[PDB]
Design an enzyme around this catalytic site. Structure first.
Site, mmCIF file in Angstrom:
data_model
loop_
_atom_site.group_PDB
_atom_site.id
_atom_site.type_symbol
_atom_site.label_atom_id
_atom_site.label_comp_id
_atom_site.label_asym_id
_atom_site.label_seq_id
_atom_site.Cartn_x
_atom_site.Cartn_y
_atom_site.Cartn_z
ATOM 1 N N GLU A 1 35.720 85.562 62.764
ATOM 2 C CA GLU A 1 34.948 84.446 63.290
ATOM 3 C C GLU A 1 33.710 84.216 62.441
ATOM 4 O OE1 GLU A 1 34.042 84.478 67.544
ATOM 5 O OE2 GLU A 1 32.554 82.887 67.289
ATOM 6 N N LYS B 1 31.480 87.146 76.252
ATOM 7 C CA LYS B 1 32.276 86.954 75.054
ATOM 8 C C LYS B 1 31.417 87.161 73.815
ATOM 9 C CE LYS B 1 34.456 84.239 71.861
ATOM 10 N NZ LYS B 1 34.030 84.007 70.473
ATOM 11 N N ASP C 1 39.901 101.553 70.762
ATOM 12 C CA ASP C 1 40.752 100.677 71.567
ATOM 13 C C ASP C 1 39.867 99.635 72.257
ATOM 14 O OD1 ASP C 1 42.337 99.472 73.478
ATOM 15 O OD2 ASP C 1 43.384 101.321 74.054
ATOM 16 N N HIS D 1 18.031 66.125 63.628
ATOM 17 C CA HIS D 1 18.095 66.141 65.086
ATOM 18 C C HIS D 1 17.525 64.865 65.688
HETATM 19 N N1 LIG Z 1 32.388 80.973 72.384
HETATM 20 C C1 LIG Z 1 33.202 80.456 71.445
HETATM 21 O O1 LIG Z 1 34.394 80.526 71.609
HETATM 22 C C2 LIG Z 1 32.714 79.825 70.141
HETATM 23 C C3 LIG Z 1 33.574 79.932 69.102
HETATM 24 N N2 LIG Z 1 33.511 79.502 67.820
HETATM 25 C C4 LIG Z 1 34.587 79.740 66.761
HETATM 26 O O2 LIG Z 1 34.994 78.296 66.129
HETATM 27 C C5 LIG Z 1 36.329 78.224 66.114
HETATM 28 C C6 LIG Z 1 36.880 77.315 67.246
HETATM 29 O O3 LIG Z 1 36.232 76.049 67.280
HETATM 30 P P1 LIG Z 1 37.032 74.657 66.823
HETATM 31 O O4 LIG Z 1 36.195 73.461 67.059
HETATM 32 O O5 LIG Z 1 38.277 74.527 67.597
HETATM 33 O O6 LIG Z 1 37.434 74.754 65.201
HETATM 34 P P2 LIG Z 1 36.965 73.717 64.051
HETATM 35 O O7 LIG Z 1 35.482 73.629 64.061
HETATM 36 O O8 LIG Z 1 37.462 74.262 62.679
HETATM 37 O O9 LIG Z 1 37.577 72.219 64.332
HETATM 38 C C7 LIG Z 1 39.008 72.029 64.420
HETATM 39 C C8 LIG Z 1 39.536 71.355 63.111
HETATM 40 O O10 LIG Z 1 40.867 71.209 63.161
HETATM 41 C C9 LIG Z 1 41.206 69.638 62.879
HETATM 42 N N3 LIG Z 1 42.511 69.275 63.450
HETATM 43 C C10 LIG Z 1 43.700 69.032 62.944
HETATM 44 N N4 LIG Z 1 44.558 68.757 63.949
HETATM 45 C C11 LIG Z 1 43.886 68.841 65.098
HETATM 46 C C12 LIG Z 1 44.285 68.662 66.402
HETATM 47 N N5 LIG Z 1 45.574 68.310 66.974
HETATM 48 N N6 LIG Z 1 43.427 68.804 67.373
HETATM 49 C C13 LIG Z 1 42.161 69.125 67.088
HETATM 50 N N7 LIG Z 1 41.764 69.307 65.802
HETATM 51 C C14 LIG Z 1 42.623 69.164 64.807
HETATM 52 C C15 LIG Z 1 40.155 68.999 63.371
HETATM 53 O O11 LIG Z 1 40.070 67.591 62.944
HETATM 54 P P3 LIG Z 1 39.602 67.025 61.463
HETATM 55 O O12 LIG Z 1 39.824 68.084 60.321
HETATM 56 O O13 LIG Z 1 40.461 65.708 61.111
HETATM 57 O O14 LIG Z 1 38.077 66.634 61.537
HETATM 58 C C16 LIG Z 1 38.959 69.931 62.922
HETATM 59 O O15 LIG Z 1 38.660 69.800 61.650
HETATM 60 C C17 LIG Z 1 36.797 79.706 66.317
HETATM 61 O O16 LIG Z 1 36.722 80.390 65.196
HETATM 62 C C18 LIG Z 1 35.726 80.230 67.294
HETATM 63 O O17 LIG Z 1 35.802 81.684 67.357
HETATM 64 C C19 LIG Z 1 32.365 78.862 67.492
HETATM 65 C C20 LIG Z 1 31.348 78.645 68.454
HETATM 66 C C21 LIG Z 1 31.410 79.114 69.865
#
Ligand SMILES: NC(=O)C1=CN([C@@H]2O[C@H](COP(=O)(O)OP(=O)(O)OC[C@H]3O[C@@H](n4cnc5c(N)ncnc54)[C@H](OP(=O)(O)O)[C@@H]3O)[C@@H](O)[C@H]2O)C=CC1
Lengths: 414, 369
Positions: free
Chosen positions: A71, A253, A269, A368
């Site tokens: 992560e 988490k 573990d 911002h």
């Molecule tokens: N408490 C928590 O869980 C937190 C976790 N995280 C970490 O960040 C990550 C999860 O966040 P997440 O926003 O999901 O990841 P990302 O920030 O990498 O965003 C998802 C990427 O996948 C693209 N994409 C392609 N197909 C799809 C689809 N069907 N649906 C959605 N997106 C798609 C998106 O669109 P496009 O490329 O066209 O723009 C985007 O770029 C994990 O590593 C997590 O551990 C971070 C902060 C807080």
């Protein structure tokens, strides 16, 4: 620094023996042959990043902690938190107790009250039986230390025998399971009941470990009132995780982003630690945040504290088989289980601190302000073409609010 | 073709048997046969202060039958007997017709916590009256997700009394194939100003919630007594004891913790294999286990004496992903998804939910037998 520059720096710090350092520079992995001994149906291996968290100060001793996480920003956060908390004296940590708990569940006990009293009266004899069933641990200085019997009413009623065992440096699942299996026949005869199971418990309340830190407001911000404001918001964030399970899950988490990273690195573990801790988080009838952040207004210090079941090990599992796990223990100076537990607890609290600080901090300033102004533009009712002119005027003021967005929207349209 | 003899086969023979199954493309099979790992260079972009990589075993659990579809499930675990138990349970349950799984909803929850709200009731009504306007504001903050068919779908407000009182705005967001942490956090940052204005309060935070109750997934199975034992009545006794062990986990948190741990031996193993955040799933699920006021077992096993079946069921928050994070950067994670037939996130959630229940079945059966 680059990857290679990181290795040179680690080499100059002399944290690893020459042999371990060379092993790390060759990025030596557990082989498929060894992996085949840890698991079943093995068809290969799977790699994650291996990172270092420097300047982790626990009870006056400084460590470089290994992390295994996929992560982004997790390692950076832990390093940031550790640096600040080192400025503030590091962590203070202690192990309250270190014993593992196992249980035999009995059912169809006609006279539970009598069965409870009979078993309790044979305590020493039953503990001696468990010790004789696994005789190596007593020779090495450990063994089964206590026993309690509880009636658990319900559908159906259960009579539960718990044993408390000193497993020394090992996790002891096999030890407890062996002791409990030996107790089943006599527990059945004593209770005239049926044994359902004999198994260790991952609700490891005999292995609680506490870590704390004490951070003067000046380490949070140079602007006297600002540092207090950040501290106050962190305490409020900690209070919020006590009030909303939806927040509590995320708060906890965040702790386990760090804890699980060092558990993996040390061959421990993490399903066991996760289960015990998340269960501990709901002992008061509500699932709550696992750590507490409070203000010391008189001393102007932010105080963090976290207690968890932390029955980690330094022997067993893959600790001897995965060569990089062995390196992780060497990197830490080969701590005992108690010392390792206190390091892990501090790391979890460090991870939590960096998350809360980032959560409550505001004001990207340059960028911002355009985000703020666009939201107010839209709420004011700006249509698509009006948004860019609106934002431009707003962000050019010393301050602005919704009323400003609405007034400028009217100027736009009038 | 048959998976018989797979566990006793050598590593090299297991790879050959996998090849005979024709589950992987020539490139993916080649990748696995050379045991290709994520490089240090790619690791260096997923984490910080990287000085190397860390390896674990990679195993297969064959014959996982979910909603009439058979899968070969990848596992990453360092605990002996975990893969064997999951494979044993999966085969028995395939005999019994496999799992039935359903997704109730697939949305993520995020929250803004407001404090110093003088008039929570008024703020609550003002915010609700701009719901549609607030949802459109959030969607413009992350417009790529809406182009894909997702986005902010709902918003509600709760007073949480205490020390002090909080006014909490929750948003419910369709994140499609991603976990959506960045999506929700971005929308939430955009909502902070307007929510403060509407409430006349102070924003404490805006952050996604890992208590993912808008992403519940249920899996179940029905195992005839004859699939639990050849001796007949012994099968009913095993069913009866497994149900009893499930009941014990409803009664004693000391047992529930171990019961639920045993489930996550399997769940975390396939989560790692598919590049998903196992801290997130662990946290939400363990939170779910105490929703009734006591920390309890996450699955229920019950006797159906009339149909002569042992019945298993488990509902969990399962907001897993098939896009984002390390998904695709780690070559073995990409391979794991290809191995599963590139399931949608919804489909993957149903496979993982089934795996956890399979793992649980083997633990309880071994415990009481
Ligand atoms: N408490 C928590 O869980 C937190 C976790 N995280 C970490 O960040 C990550 C999860 O966040 P997440 O926003 O999901 O990841 P990302 O920030 O990498 O965003 C998802 C990427 O996948 C693209 N994409 C392609 N197909 C799809 C689809 N069907 N649906 C959605 N997106 C798609 C998106 O669109 P496009 O490329 O066209 O723009 C985007 O770029 C994990 O590593 C997590 O551990 C971070 C902060 C807080």
């Amino acid at each position: 620094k680059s990857y290679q520059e990181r290795l040179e720096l680690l080499k100059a710090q002399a944290l690893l023996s020459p042999e371990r350092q060379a092993s790390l520079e060759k990025d030596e992995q557990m082989s498929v042959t060894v992996a085949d001994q840890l698991s079943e149906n093995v068809v290969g291996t799977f790699s994650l990043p291996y990172s270092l968290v420097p300047e982790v100060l626990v009870n006056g001793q400084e460590y470089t902690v290994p992390y295994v996480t996929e992560e982004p920003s997790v390692v950076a956060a832990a390093s940031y938190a550790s640096k600040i908390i080192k400025r503030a004296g590091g962590f203070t940590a202690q192990v309250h107790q270190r014993q593992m708990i196992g249980q035999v569940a009995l059912y169809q006990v006609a006279n539970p009250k009598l069965a409870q009293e009979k078993i309790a009266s044979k305590k020493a004899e039953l503990l001696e039986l468990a010790n004789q069933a696994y005789p190596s641990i007593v020779k090495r200085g450990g063994g089964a230390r206590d026993l309690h019997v509880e009636q658990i009413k319900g559908e159906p009623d259960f009579l539960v025998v718990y044993i408390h065992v000193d497993t020394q440096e090992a996790m002891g699942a096999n030890m407890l399971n062996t002791m409990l299996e030996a107790l089943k026949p006599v527990l059945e005869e004593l209770s005239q009941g049926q044994s359902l199971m004999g198994i260790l418990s991952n609700y490891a309340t005999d292995s609680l470990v506490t870590a704390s830190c004490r951070i003067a407001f000046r380490y949070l911000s140079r602007q006297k009132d600002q540092g207090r404001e950040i501290a106050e918001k962190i305490a409020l964030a900690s209070q919020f995780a006590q009030a909303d399970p939806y927040r509590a899950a995320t708060h906890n988490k965040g702790i386990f982003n760090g804890i699980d990273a060092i558990l993996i690195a040390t061959g421990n573990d993490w399903r066991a630690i996760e289960a015990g801790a998340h269960a501990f988080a709901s002992r008061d009838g509500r699932y709550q945040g696992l750590s507490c952040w409070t203000l010391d207004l008189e001393r102007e210090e932010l105080v963090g504290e976290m207690t968890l079941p932390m029955p980690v090990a330094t022997k067993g599992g893959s600790i001897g088989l995965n060569p990089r796990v062995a390196l992780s223990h060497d990197l830490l100076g080969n701590p005992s289980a108690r010392e390792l537990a206190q390091i892990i607890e501090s790391i979890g609290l460090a991870q939590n601190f960096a998350a809360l600080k980032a959560l409550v901090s505001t004001g990207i300033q340059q960028g911002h302000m355009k985000l703020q102004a666009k939201s107010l533009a839209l709420l004011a009712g700006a249509s698509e073409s009006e948004v860019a002119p609106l934002v431009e005027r707003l962000i050019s003021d010393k301050t602005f609010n919704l009323e400003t967005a609405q007034r400028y929207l009217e100027n736009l349209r009038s």
